[PDB]
Amino acid sequence: TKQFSVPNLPLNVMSNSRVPSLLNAMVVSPDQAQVVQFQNGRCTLDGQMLGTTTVSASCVARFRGKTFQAPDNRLGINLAEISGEPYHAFESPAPLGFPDFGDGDWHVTATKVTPSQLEANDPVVVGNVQPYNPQFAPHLGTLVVENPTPDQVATGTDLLFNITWLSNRANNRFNPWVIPNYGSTLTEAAQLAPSIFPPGFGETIVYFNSTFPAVGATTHAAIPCLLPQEFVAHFVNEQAPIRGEAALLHYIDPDTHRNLGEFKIYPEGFVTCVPNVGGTGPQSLPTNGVFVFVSWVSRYYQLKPVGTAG
Amino acid sequence: TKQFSVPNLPLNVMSNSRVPSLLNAMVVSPDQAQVVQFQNGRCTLDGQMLGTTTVSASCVARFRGKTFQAPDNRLGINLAEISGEPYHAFESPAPLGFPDFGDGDWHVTATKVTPSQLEANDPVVVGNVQPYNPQFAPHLGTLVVENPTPDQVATGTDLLFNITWLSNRANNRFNPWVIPNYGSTLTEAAQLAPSIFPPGFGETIVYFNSTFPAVGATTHAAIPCLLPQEFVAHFVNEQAPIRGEAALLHYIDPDTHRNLGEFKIYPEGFVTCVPNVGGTGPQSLPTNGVFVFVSWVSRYYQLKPVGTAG
Ligand SMILES: CC(=O)N[C@@H]1[C@@H](O[C@@H]2O[C@@H](C)[C@@H](O)[C@@H](O)[C@@H]2O)[C@H](O[C@@H]2O[C@H](CO)[C@H](O)[C@H](O)[C@H]2O)[C@@H](CO)O[C@@H]1O
Ligand SMILES: CC(=O)N[C@@H]1[C@@H](O[C@@H]2O[C@@H](C)[C@@H](O)[C@@H](O)[C@@H]2O)[C@H](O[C@@H]2O[C@H](CO)[C@H](O)[C@H](O)[C@H]2O)[C@@H](CO)O[C@@H]1O
Ligand SMILES: [Cl-]
Ligand SMILES: [Cl-]
Ligand SMILES: [Cl-]
Ligand SMILES: [Cl-]
Ligand SMILES: [Cl-]
Ligand SMILES: [Cl-]
Ligand SMILES: [Cl-]
Ligand SMILES: [Cl-]
Ligand SMILES: [Cl-]
Ligand SMILES: [Cl-]
Ligand SMILES: [Cl-]
Ligand SMILES: [Cl-]
Ligand SMILES: [Cl-]
Ligand SMILES: [Cl-]
Ligand SMILES: [Cl-]
Ligand SMILES: [Cl-]
Ligand SMILES: [Mg+2]
Ligand SMILES: [Mg+2]
């Protein structure tokens, strides 16, 4: 009897589910060549999170661990959950919220989080994580911080990391669609969230974009995700059973109260639209509108085209 | 017709409303000597945010602005909203999400956010904000970053700031209850969220704590808030009319499904309990329980004592 719904927050007050940033756009990208397989911001409509998705906004693209000394003044990190609870292999692709950008450098700022170590002095460690490096093994709970400052940190120091910015590899652009290689062999329990394949009926996947310090990106400083973090939190909170093959949403103007565009959101946890031919689809719509659940529909419900013709 | 409710997320997956951190405790402190007047994490039960409270998790304790040169190689900042929209004086105490810690230094990490300035190079600016400094004027839209690195940033650079850590002033401890002096004279529209006074009936205010890099604090690295950010977002989303003088909550074990403790949440947006005499009140309860709305009650409903006797 719990009926389905989406948060009725304006798009531009909701946040990305792959970096901790405001959403400021939605886009389509039909003719781009990458698999769609983000591990963060993945949640079914009845509230089952997939991949490494956490419900917690403050865990999105964070990681935590304890220091040990690796060769050549590199800083090894034994991962834990951001909560401090232990992380064990063979159960998920990586700890909850663990960043899912594999195509470039993570410039990280960390702080000590042990209260006894926070009575005095600078608690910051900065450095650079290279997910394409051969010592990147997040599924088994270990990674390396290159070029740390301070360059010597006592073994066993508990550190909470944020990604201050992302950057391209040398002579490439940073593609924010590329997920990391989590390493190992994932058990069936620890499987990646599946890849999303393009839906039929002239539909294309809608991405919720944030401006983010992703330097040298293929997108010009924009990080895409499939669901606002508030959508993830809403579905986990609600646990509304799936009662149709897709959910029709209207994107409503808050001023005029009128329908700006039709969208479908699929049980697997992704949004589509039909772009008006020869235009940017939903990208030209105002960003202060609100998504509203209309009804369940079947997969073959035909959406009215959204956006302008160019 | 819209009935009241609280998010049914476990305490330890929700987040602070004054810093972007997981909640990991709830405490009482009936005897601490400060006024209770946070400006973030303030929301009525029918969903009106107060002070500088934003609904957006990724705006909590952030600020944004454009650089100008101040005397003695200080970095002046003309504030904007985190969304980039202009901030005008005389309407709120400070921009939405603006940090509300007045008793110590804010060690900040900023990045450029203009996409054209993110095609290449290091976008980071770090420095220190001193809210007790005479050039701290957030209501009128301006503040100063002391000791910036780089020490010269082009005028007009758009910067998004996070607080990496907080620290005590010299020869003092950092009290996280103290809010900034926002300056000026606040118009009636721009008024601070009111102070909360101790309730009757043996009740005391419940604080939701996070471990946070607050160095040299009176709390030993713990930041208190009145409401989890998810509660704020829930009330704004729901807009459930107030239908009683207080809302009785139970804090339910997710395993045994039994009631761990009775709490009241008041229309003004704060939680209370009655601590069992001579103990820490709710602090000893497991942090993985879930708050559930029982009913509206009057102010004189008498809560069963929570916690152990010591
Ligand atoms: C041992 C010593 O004096 N070290 C100082 C730093 O002071 C210590 O660390 C800070 C974080 C604070 O806890 C102080 O009480 C400690 O004694 C000093 O840090 C500055 O300290 C002032 C207050 O004394 C403010 O908190 C600043 O924000 C801190 O940066 C640094 C830099 O001056 O110098 C020595 O390491
Ligand atoms: C003009 C120049 O060569 N500057 C380099 C930096 O490279 C530029 O900035 C980075 C962020 C990237 O956009 C490069 O494509 C630019 O040319 C260099 O930064 C490192 O660059 C590598 C890739 O070249 C990675 O992105 C690293 O993560 C960056 O730190 C710095 C440090 O090596 O040196 C000069 O400033
Ligand atoms: Cl039904
Ligand atoms: Cl809805
Ligand atoms: Cl979670
Ligand atoms: Cl400790
Ligand atoms: Cl993998
Ligand atoms: Cl457009
Ligand atoms: Cl249909
Ligand atoms: Cl009624
Ligand atoms: Cl209802
Ligand atoms: Cl109503
Ligand atoms: Cl409830
Ligand atoms: Cl807001
Ligand atoms: Cl630009
Ligand atoms: Cl009443
Ligand atoms: Cl205790
Ligand atoms: Cl009563
Ligand atoms: Mg899992
Ligand atoms: Mg206001």
> Per residue, what are the HEC states of B213-279?
CEECECCCCEEEECCCHHHHHHHHHHCCCCCCCEEEEEEECCCCCCEEEEEEEECCCEEEECECCCC
* Strands A214-215 and A158-168, sheet pairing: parallel
User: In sequence order, which ranges of A78-140 are alpha helices (DSSP H)?
Assistant: none
Whether residue B308 sits in one domain with residue B206: yes
Check: CB of residue B69 under 8 Å from CB of residue B76.
yes
Chain B residues touching residue A14 (CB < 8 angstroms): 56
Q: Is A134 exposed, middle or buried (0-12, 13-18, 19+ CB in 10 A)?
A: exposed
Q: From CA A287, how far away is CA A253, in angstroms rounded? A: 9
Residue with tokens 């389905």: A4
Contact (CB<8Å) A236/B9: yes
Nearest Cα neighbor of B16 from B186, B288, B285, B209 is B209
Give backbone dihedrals phi and psi of A236, rounded to 5 degrees, phi first.
-60, -40
CA distances from A131 to A101, B52, B119, B209 (A): 8, 38, 21, 33
Whether residue A106 sits in one domain with residue A46: no
Whether residue A203 sits in one domain with residue A142: no
Write out the residue range of the structural domain in which residue A70 sits: 60-167
Listed resolution, Å: 2.3
Nearest Cα neighbor of B76 from B157, B141, B145, B161 is B145
If DSSP codes are grouped into helix, strand and coil, which group holds residue A229?
Answer: helix
Mention every residue, 6+ apart, whose C-beta is less than 8 A from residue B185.
none
* Strands A270-273 and A204-211, sheet pairing: antiparallel
- What are the residues facing A109 on neighbouring strands? A126, A162
What is the tally of structural domains in chain A? 2
Residue with tokens 């591990």: A39
Check: CB of residue A149 under 8 Å from CB of residue A127.
yes
Chain A residues touching residue B113 (CB < 8 angstroms): 211, 213, 221
Reported residue count of chain B is 310
HSE-CB at B98 with a 13 A cutoff on CA atoms is 31
Mention every residue, 6+ apart, whose C-beta is less than 8 A from residue A167.
A104, A105, A107, A174, A214, A215, A216
Mention every residue, 6+ apart, whose C-beta is less than 8 A from residue B261.
B250, B251, B273, B282, B285, B304, B306, B307
Nearest CB to A123; choose among B16, B213, B236: B213
Nearest Cα neighbor of A63 from A123, A118, A108, A126 is A108
Q: How far is CA B280 from the centre of its chain?
A: 23
Chain B residue at shortest CA distance from A62? B21
Which method was used?
X-ray
Q: Which structure tokens are listed for B163?
A: 């607080």
Q: From CA A207, how far away is CA A203, in angstroms rounded? A: 13
Q: From CA B199, how far away is CA B189, in angstroms rounded? A: 26
Whether residue B239 sits in one domain with residue B197: yes
HSE-CB at B5 with a 13 A cutoff on CA atoms is 12
User: Letter for the amino acid at A185?
Assistant: T
Q: From CA A62, how far away is CA A39, in angstroms rounded? A: 13
Whether residue A183 sits in one domain with residue A53: yes
B8: which DSSP letter? -
Q: From CA B183, how far away is CA B140, in angstroms rounded? A: 8
Check: CB of residue B169 under 8 Å from CB of residue B105.
yes
B121: left (phi over 0), alpha (psi -120 to 50) or beta: left
Chain A residues touching residue B14 (CB < 8 angstroms): 56
Cα torsion angle, B78, B83, B84, B89, sign: negative
Q: From CA B31, how far away is CA B11, in angstroms rounded? A: 24
Chain B residues touching residue A214 (CB < 8 angstroms): 118
Q: Quote the ligand 3 centre to A13 CA distance (angstroms).
A: 32
A10: which DSSP letter? B
- What are the residues facing A163 on neighbouring strands? A108
Chain A residues touching residue B95 (CB < 8 angstroms): none
Q: Which residues surround ligand 16, an ion (CB under 5 A)?
A: B 244
Give backbone dihedrals phi and psi of A256, rounded to 5 degrees, phi first.
-80, -15
Contact (CB<8Å) A215/B123: yes
* Strands B214-215 and B158-168, sheet pairing: parallel
Q: From CA A71, how far away is CA A283, in angstroms rounded? A: 48
Q: Which structure tokens are listed for B116?
A: 């054209």
Chain B residue at shortest CA distance from A230? B233
If DSSP codes are grouped into helix, strand and coil, which group holds residue A278?
Answer: coil
Check: CB of residue A22 under 8 Å from CB of residue B59.
yes
- What is chain B's Cα-based Rg? 20
Q: Whose CA is nearest to atom 14 of ligand 1?
A: A120
* Strands B142-149 and B204-211, sheet pairing: unpaired
CB count, 10 Å around CB of B149?
A: 11
Which helix (DSSP H) or strand (DSSP E) does residue A234 occupy?
helix A229-238
Whether residue A269 sits in one domain with residue A205: yes
Q: From CA A165, how far away is CA A106, in angstroms rounded? A: 6
Whether residue A300 sits in one domain with residue A208: yes
Q: Which structure tokens are listed for A61?
A: 């693209």
Chain B residues touching residue A215 (CB < 8 angstroms): 118-123
Question: Ligand 2, closest atom to CA B122?
Answer: 11
Mention every residue, 6+ apart, whose C-beta is less than 8 A from residue A19.
A60, A61, A163, A210, A212, A223
Q: From CA B185, how far away is CA B200, in angstroms rounded? A: 32
Q: Quote the ligand 18 centre to B294 CA distance (angstroms).
A: 12
Check: CB of residue B200 under 8 Å from CB of residue B40.
no
If DSSP codes are grouped into helix, strand and coil, which group holds residue B57?
Answer: helix
- Chain B: nearest CA to A115, how far in angstroms? 5
Q: Quote the ligand 10 centre to B1 CA distance (angstroms).
A: 5
Mention every residue, 6+ apart, whose C-beta is less than 8 A from residue B49.
B42, B43, B55, B232, B236
In chain B the first and final C-alpha atoms are separated, in Å, by 43
Q: Which structure tokens are listed for A271?
A: 């949004």
Q: Does the CB of B83 have a partner CB in chain A at under 8 Å?
A: yes
HSE-CB at B106 with a 13 A cutoff on CA atoms is 27
Ligand nearest to the CA of A5: 4
Binding residues of A for Mg(2+): 91-92
Among candidate residues A144, A167, A190, the one where a domain is terminated: A167
Chain B residue at shortest CA distance from A222? B115
Contact (CB<8Å) A220/B119: yes
Question: Ligand 2, closest atom to CA B119?
Answer: 13
Q: Is B136 exposed, middle or buried (0-12, 13-18, 19+ CB in 10 A)?
A: middle
Q: From CA B245, how far away is CA B265, in angstroms rounded? A: 9
- Restricting to A residues 244-283, those with a Cβ less than 8 Å away from any Cβ of B are none
Nearest CB to B111; choose among A165, A229, A236: A165
Q: Quote the ligand 5 centre to B91 CA distance (angstroms).
A: 37
HSE-CB at B151 with a 13 A cutoff on CA atoms is 4
Q: From CA A116, how far away is CA A125, in angstroms rounded? A: 17
Q: How far is CA A64 from the centre of its chain?
A: 17
Q: Quote the ligand 12 centre to B4 CA distance (angstroms).
A: 9
Question: A168: Cβ below 6 Å to ligand 2?
Answer: yes
Identify whether A150 is preceded by a cis peptide bond (ω within 30 of 0): yes
A11: left (phi over 0), alpha (psi -120 to 50) or beta: alpha
Question: A170: Cβ below 6 Å to ligand 2?
Answer: yes
CA distances from B108 to A124, B124, B177 (A): 11, 10, 20
Whether residue A104 sits in one domain with residue A4: no
Nearest CB to B58; choose among A21, A107, A236: A21
User: Letter for the amino acid at B268?
Assistant: E
Reported residue count of chain A is 310
Among candidate residues A167, A191, A219, the one where a domain is terminated: A167
B33: left (phi over 0), alpha (psi -120 to 50) or beta: alpha
Contact (CB<8Å) B58/A57: yes
Q: From CA A152, how far away is CA B305, in angstroms rounded? A: 49
Q: From CA B143, how far away is CA B167, in angstroms rounded? A: 18
Residue with tokens 């045994």: B256
- What are the residues facing A273 on neighbouring strands? A204
Pocket of ligand 1 (CB under 6 A): A 120-121; B 105, 128, 167-170, 215-216
Nearest CB to A215; choose among B56, B121, B215: B121
Whether residue B206 sits in one domain with residue B91: no
In chain A the first and final C-alpha atoms are separated, in Å, by 43
**What number of C-beta contacts closer than 8 Å exist between A and B?**
133
Whether residue B181 sits in one domain with residue B308: yes
Whether residue B186 sits in one domain with residue B45: yes
Q: From CA B81, how far away is CA B160, in angstroms rounded? A: 10
Q: From CA A136, how far away is CA A129, in angstroms rounded? A: 8
Among candidate residues A167, A192, A214, the one where a domain is terminated: A167
Whether residue B175 sits in one domain with residue B291: yes
Question: Ligand 1, closest atom to CA A122?
Answer: 11
User: Letter for the amino acid at B85?
Assistant: E
Q: From CA A172, how far away is CA A119, in angstroms rounded? A: 43
If DSSP codes are grouped into helix, strand and coil, which group holds residue A58?
Answer: helix
Q: Is A195 exposed, middle or buried (0-12, 13-18, 19+ CB in 10 A)?
A: exposed
Cα torsion angle, B30, B33, B35, B38, sign: negative
Nearest CB to A221; choose among B14, B118, B230: B118
Mention every residue, 6+ apart, whose C-beta is less than 8 A from residue B114.
B157, B158
Check: CB of residue A12 under 8 Å from CB of residue A254.
no
Q: Quote the ligand 14 centre to A136 CA distance (angstroms).
A: 38
Max Cα-Cα span within chain B: 62
Nearest Cα neighbor of B238 from A234, A269, A262 is A234
Q: From CA B217, how far away is CA B207, in angstroms rounded? A: 16
